[PDB]
Amino acid sequence: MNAVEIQGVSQRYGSMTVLHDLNLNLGEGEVLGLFGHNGAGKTTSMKLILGLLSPSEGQVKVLGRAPNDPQVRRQLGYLPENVTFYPQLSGRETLRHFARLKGAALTQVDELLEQVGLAHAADRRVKTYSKGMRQRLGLAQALLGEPRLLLLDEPTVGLDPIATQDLYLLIDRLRQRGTSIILCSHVLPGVEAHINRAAILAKGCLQAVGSLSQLRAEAGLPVRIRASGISERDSWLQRWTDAGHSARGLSESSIEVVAVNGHKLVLLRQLLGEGEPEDIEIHQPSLEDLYRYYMERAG
Amino acid sequence: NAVEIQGVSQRYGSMTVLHDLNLNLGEGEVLGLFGHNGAGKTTSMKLILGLLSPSEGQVKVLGRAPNDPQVRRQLGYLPENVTFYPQLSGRETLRHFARLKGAALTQVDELLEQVGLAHAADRRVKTYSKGMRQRLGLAQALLGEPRLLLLDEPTVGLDPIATQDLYLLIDRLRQRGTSIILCSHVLPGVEAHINRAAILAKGCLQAVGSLSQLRAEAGLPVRIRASGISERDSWLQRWTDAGHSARGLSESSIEVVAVNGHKLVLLRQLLGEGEPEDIEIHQPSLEDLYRYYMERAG
Amino acid sequence: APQSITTLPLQPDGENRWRLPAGEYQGQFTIEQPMQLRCEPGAVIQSQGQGSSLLISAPDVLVEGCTLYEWGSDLTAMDSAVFILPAAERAQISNNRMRGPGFGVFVDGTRDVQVIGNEIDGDAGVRSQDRGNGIHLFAVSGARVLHNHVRNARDGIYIDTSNGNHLEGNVIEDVRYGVHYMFANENSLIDNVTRRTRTGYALMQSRKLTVTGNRSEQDQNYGILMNYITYSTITGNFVSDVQRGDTGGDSMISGGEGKALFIYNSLFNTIENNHFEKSSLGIHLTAGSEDNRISGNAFVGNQQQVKYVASRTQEWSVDGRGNYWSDYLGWDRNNDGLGDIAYEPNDNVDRLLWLYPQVRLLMNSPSIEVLRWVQRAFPVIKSPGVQDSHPLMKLPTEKLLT
Amino acid sequence: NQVWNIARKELSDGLRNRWLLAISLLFAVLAVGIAWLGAAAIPATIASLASLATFLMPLIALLLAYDAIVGEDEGGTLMLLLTYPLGRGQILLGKFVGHGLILALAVLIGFGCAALAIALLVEGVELGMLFWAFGRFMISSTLLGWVFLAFAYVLSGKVNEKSSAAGLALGVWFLFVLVFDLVLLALLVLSEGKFNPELLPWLLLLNPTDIYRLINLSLPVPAAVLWLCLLAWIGVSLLLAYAIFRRR
Amino acid sequence: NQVWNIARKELSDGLRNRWLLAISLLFAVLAVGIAWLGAAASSIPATIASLASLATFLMPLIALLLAYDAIVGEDEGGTLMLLLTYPLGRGQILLGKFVGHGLILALAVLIGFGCAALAIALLVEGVELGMLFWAFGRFMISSTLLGWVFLAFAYVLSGKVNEKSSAAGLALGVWFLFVLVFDLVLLALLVLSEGKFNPELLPWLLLLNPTDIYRLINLSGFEGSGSAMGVLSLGADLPVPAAVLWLCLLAWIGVSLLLAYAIFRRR
């Protein structure tokens, strides 16, 4: 049962259509990443999943219902980017305010204050909070009630890498329960270890959707095989140039091979069969390089 | 030898919020300070800029004093969040910083095109995005051939096309001979461009060195997963003979947590017996090394 | 109409002095001989309601101790109680009681007539339009009317073209006008008391006269009304609580909201040491009446001190000494009696209210309270008013409240 | 009802505003300091209190609610609140209840200490007339403040930035307190041949500061028309604010 | 010089503030309107004492609108921490802001009292052009000094606070205290004591208020009536001459600028 079924929307403002023929299907437990520029391609598709806008030529089916029902929004967390709450209110009173609006029980406030790590800075004003301290508060209102869909618009800005890794450990605890969430982020290294299926989209259209194994298979991108002192860099740099592969000799006594990842099963056999692999690093083409490819695939 | 910090144990309020960090930076390296947003990382950032006084120790930036005007023309500082002057324009803000640093006035027109901001030149800073102000914040940092950049999270609020283009602009300046310090918190991704990390925690500089040294001084598992193996039940045992726990989650999703002490025999275990489908050799990233050293300090 | 010799007067002394015993009488009476007649206190000489009861045509008549009752009311034929001819020079009318609907004391053409110490109760039922005058004086030179008690007559002590005469210490209660003056050049009146009156002092077209020490207690709508008085002297008057009302006849004046002093076309007069207390208007200065010595008064308790509808400046301090104002929020650094800053009693917004009465709806607005502060900060928009340099700090009229 | 659940926020957030508590303390001292100079030195002092509460109760209302809508849009919580089970009507009406009971309490500290300074410093004030003339005073001062509360929601919903919202909140305060009555006087003292003065008692109904003084100065209309025209200034401008808030 | 290089910014940044140009055109259209009403009525000592009260309400207002966000507006904007990493000192980015914002007040009152003089020489027939230039030259080189006091007051209350929302509360507090509270506390002290508190100390409290030293300078020659002065009638009791009255206004700059530098040096 798919959570978000964006079924052929086409959103326009005047004559310009800022989002054209978007066709998404988020599953019941998938973690999707809406990647693109900060213009109207991504940030309007984030609003159609909410009840904020209306599909000018389509329909959205969030949890099998219309997106503006009160039964939908009681089980739908949403952390927005660059949020700054009411600074004269306290940290506990802001969550106690937001629990009354979503219909969540007031015994879930002190559970979520301990869960995000805000127990020491509770009962202090929001004006004496840091940037990352407010991201823990903005995450904590998204977990109120029993949500089945989260739209975390840039959750890891200004957060320490323990707390960044604490957030993604909370995501995999959440998606096992059945809460399929949506990332709308821009720090593309780091999110790529947790994205179930990316959703890189251009200015207007939706460029590519599917898993990271499906993006690397469709978009032909070369693997970044790095080695260091197999036999000798200079005696082995010559061998791939007559055999037809690019081997960059770089750093020093290091043979970096940018191979076309169709042959890299047997390309590593000759690299293994004649020398030691004692310091190698084969890197798959990352989501940073995949997003740079799909922006040049259209534009 | 650009930044030679030696023996500095900064005290204020008799608290000792930094202690005995010996941070020598080479003349072409890209260092990364990777503490929290607390008094370990941001205190040592203020020492290099010269706007703080190093109690009980000496800071030598470019062989001279950190607060001399002759070396402060050779620095570049991109701060954390700079909403500069919302009523000024783009060219007039950068011409203002060009007059202060002693830079030639012909550099502003070739820095607003080097950074992608010539379309938004002669436009007011209140009509700028957060990414466009980071573009403007970079433009005053490259002003008048700086021999020491110091970027404090330059890639926040920025599109990934510009982020990949910023590190190539960093890599142009590394070959030119300008030492760069990257005080950042978006640590996955920055490890491909830095030369040496410097994880400091609770004041004490815990670990320094290159990424090959931090993996050598900390036993971390390489995360080999072999999805699509032929046989998996004996492969539960065929890796644990040398201590590599063959943990799986599907019909063939055997994510073997290795030890990085048997790298010869484990790839020969995979390629000698059993056919793979899609190997993903995952080296221990900068998040796991930072989660080791901060946990080792507390 | 019989004569005074037609009664039964018992002579106490043979110097044309007679004494009427106790007992009633009837009809009008006429004095043709210089008879210094006295009366017992039970000599109620009651006329029937027509004619002048005690007409006097002989000079040097000392009328004393009578008690008169119910004379005529024909104001055209001048049905008085005591009629005094022009040939009846130097008449003394001492200590008499009168009750009747016409003139109390009508004199005309007389010299040195003395109307002293009488009690003239006018009426009770007539609408103060046909009650007749209390002490009517028509062109007399030398008269001395002193310390009488007129109550409930019509327009009090009427005086028409009488030159030299004193009005000393007489109490005037519940009448239409207190003291009426018509062309009485070089007159004088001292220490008179007017109570509950529809105009306390009518001063119409009479020059060079002295108004001194007089009291006006709770009169209606006009404390002292001065019309066309020149070279006068207003020294020591105590005008208290001029309430609003109407005169009921509206003949020469109109109804007012209550003005303790109304100066109409009076060019030169010295108005010093007075006390205008608790009225709605302390002093009304018309535009034609300017440049006269107004210094030393006490303007206390009035809801509006000066009404001056003009734009000409008007200094109110002769010889560097001004008036005491109750709302003068000033200081005194150099320890003299005078204040240090001058006092403007009127703003510009205090004269828009007089010019346009619809500003009374806007009179409580903060913008009006802004406009009161901008005049105190920017004196270019201050119209030249009725200020006085060196106002007094203490009360100069410490004796007038007694 | 969620109109009260968001009203308890604005009570708790409005009472910790340092800008409001400075003015509401300054309102309570000057209501005593006018009452001090009206007893030691009662319709003469209730008129000077009406000129005081015409200065500051629009200023208290515009300091509370100029950043109610656009202060939440700049803070980002407005975009968050619309994704909650909440209509746009319940946010505005719930802010109007929450900001309304603040200045419904600020006149009870404002005139609650002013009527204490009159009932204990006249000694014979005849308090049966006091508790009906101040009961009519505290009620009518809230309704003046609720107009400028609804005026503040109109200008908050129209602008997109907080700096130009304070530039309009200063402009409504200047126009409705002390610019509209100065141009009423300029239509009086400079025009008399083409200005009917009988029209001016009907032109007093276009200004809620002016209708505030007319029910503290008691006229072709009765008193009950002025109560229904002051409430009509609330109900139209709140409906105008709801029509602006639905077009964001 | 580095002091001018940061003055050229603030000279080009304060003139793009639309809130400045509203209330600096309001100073121009009011100084002509007072001088036009001062020309149709005639007087001369009343049109001088009203312009000095007009610049009492507005030249502290333009000075406090400029410089309340001079230090704390750069600190929370991030560009103050960047500026100390330029070859500058804390004494150069403060004195440079004072010269840069000071030339705006020197131009905002040269526009205001400049058109006020042309609305007198073209309005009052037969006026003395030597006396006009001298009296309005005394208005020009002393309303800048009143402006430079409240400019230097705003650098004191910007270095002390650490939030711009609290700097706007203090800048409104300084404008209320020095303009129309100190003139009313001294008034209420004189009425309730009836001038018998201190007959010699009370004129020296005019020197503890720079708006009162400003009013005493311009009303030196055109004295006139006592109510044209009002509270300023105490200035005839001051035994100090006119040249020291220039010097205590310059001393009000230099104490409140050295206080502004000593606060900013430990920022």
Ligand SMILES: [Mg+2]
């Ligand atoms: Mg004196």
